[PDB]
Amino acid sequence: RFNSSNDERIRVTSERVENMSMRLEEVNEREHS
Amino acid sequence: RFNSSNDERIRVTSERVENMSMRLEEVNEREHS
DSSP, X not given: OOTXXXXXXXXXXXXXXXXXXXXXXXXXXXXXX | OOTTSHHXXXXXXXXXXXXXXXXXXXXXXXXXX
16 A cells, blocks of 8 residues: 555655666666767 | 546656656666767
């Protein structure tokens, strides 16, 4: 019941979005062509 | 009406974000240059 609450889902989504944004900026910065 | 609720949108967004994070980590791990 705790893991299915809206607040926990929002927090986890925000953290994963931040990590994905950092990783995507890292990937885009590494360009050779 | 069920598919447009906030809870369903949050759950679907969280699941898709998790899948995208896993896929992005898979892509970044596969680097050759």
